[PDB]
Design a protein around this ligand. Structure first.
Ligand SMILES: [Mg+2]
Ligand SMILES: [Mg+2]
Ligand code: NA
Ligand code: NA
Ligand code: NA
Length: 312
DNA sequence: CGGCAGTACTG
DNA sequence: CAGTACT
DNA sequence: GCCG
């Protein structure tokens, strides 16, 4: 990134708007920052600034103050609440509205939350794993967690396919959590496994807490056996084989990649989800056949991108 | 002016 | 439903 | 915040 001196200031304002709930302004900042991060040259002109997609007048103006001044004055006026709102919304299950409510109620520290706040079941689990959930794990450990899930799943039906998606599949050296997609080529035997599979993982001691337990998605907490291990977030999704390519695509991400591809699909009168790519979408349409990820790219008129170049 | 991805859970 | 979360 |  040629524009660290720019984007590092912008990131502070983006995070500030985010934790304060100004989601769309933060979105604009987030995209500007990637746009700036993916420019070849340092931005050295206001008009050069407006040249890059995702940078407007207001944003070029800030990039200008940074290069002429070395600083961005708006940084000096960020509310004193922002570090606390960030502290609070880093609890899994607490977002901006909960953080703002806790702040208005006078809480300022996790000790205040622990001792005085009313916590949802999810938030109490998030709080007890506060540090662990802020840490990314080495890739090798994500491999171990995926293989733990796969072996428990293959014990029940050997035909079950399990693949770790998310940052793992995009090839990253560290992973925030582990994202495992499960299906079955029979198109049928994926059904009803969760009860058995989760109980198998739980009976082993691997699964330590459940956050979400849906008919298709599980979000929870695991910890590998032995010393020196931290608790890690684990997401598992079980899908029908007919949806495998769109489910793989969604679950591999990145999030910004998914949103950009879904926006593209919408411009073309299509709709893309983790269930299907649909066409003739009136704004339900027809589901288009997508046996592989490449089919999704092709039907959208895009060159195929391997998971590693989806890391937007 | 107004969308900015589309969906699944929770209570 | 509003809130939060997954990519 | 940006953009159609
Ligand atoms: Mg992940
Ligand atoms: Mg995840
Ligand atoms: Na631009
Ligand atoms: Na949170
Ligand atoms: Na207090």
């Amino acid at each position: 990134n040629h524009n660290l001196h720019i984007t590092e200031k912008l990131e502070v304002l983006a995070k500030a708007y985010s934790v304060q709930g100004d989601k769309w302004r933060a979105l604009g900042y987030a995209k500007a920052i990637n746009a700036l991060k993916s420019f070849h040259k340092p931005v050295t002109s206001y008009q050069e600034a407006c040249s890059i997609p995702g940078i407007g007048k207001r944003m070029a103006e800030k990039i200008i103050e940074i290069l002429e001044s070395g600083h961005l004055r708006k940084l000096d006026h960020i509310s004193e609440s922002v570090p606390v709102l960030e502290l609070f919304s880093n609890i899994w299950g607490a977002g901006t509205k909960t953080a703002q409510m806790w702040y208005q109620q006078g809480f300022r520290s996790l000790e205040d939350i622990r001792s005085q706040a009313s916590l949802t079941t999810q938030q109490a689990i998030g709080l007890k794993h506060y540090s662990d959930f802020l840490e990314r794990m080495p890739r090798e450990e994500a491999t171990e967690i995926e293989q733990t899930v796969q072996k428990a799943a293959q014990a029940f039906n050997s035909g079950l396919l399990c693949v770790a998606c998310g940052s793992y599949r995009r090839g990253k050296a560290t992973c925030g959590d582990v994202d495992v997609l499960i299906t079955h080529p029979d198109g049928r035997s994926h059904r009803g496994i969760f009860s058995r599979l989760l109980d198998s993982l739980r009976q082993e001691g691997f699964l330590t807490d459940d956050l979400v337990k849906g008919e298709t998605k599980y979000l929870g907490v695991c910890r590998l056996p032995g010393p020196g291990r931290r608790h890690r977030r684990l997401d598992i999704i079980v899908v029908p084989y007919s949806e495998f390519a769109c489910a793989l695509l969604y679950f591999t991400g990145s999030a910004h990649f998914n949103r950009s591809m879904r926006a593209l699909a919408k411009t073309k009168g299509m709709s893309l989800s983790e269930h299907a790519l649909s066409t003739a979408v009136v704004r339900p349409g027809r589901v288009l056949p997508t046996p592989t990820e490449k089919d999704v790219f092709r039907l959208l008129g895009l060159p195929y991108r391997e998971p590693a170049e989806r890391d937007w």
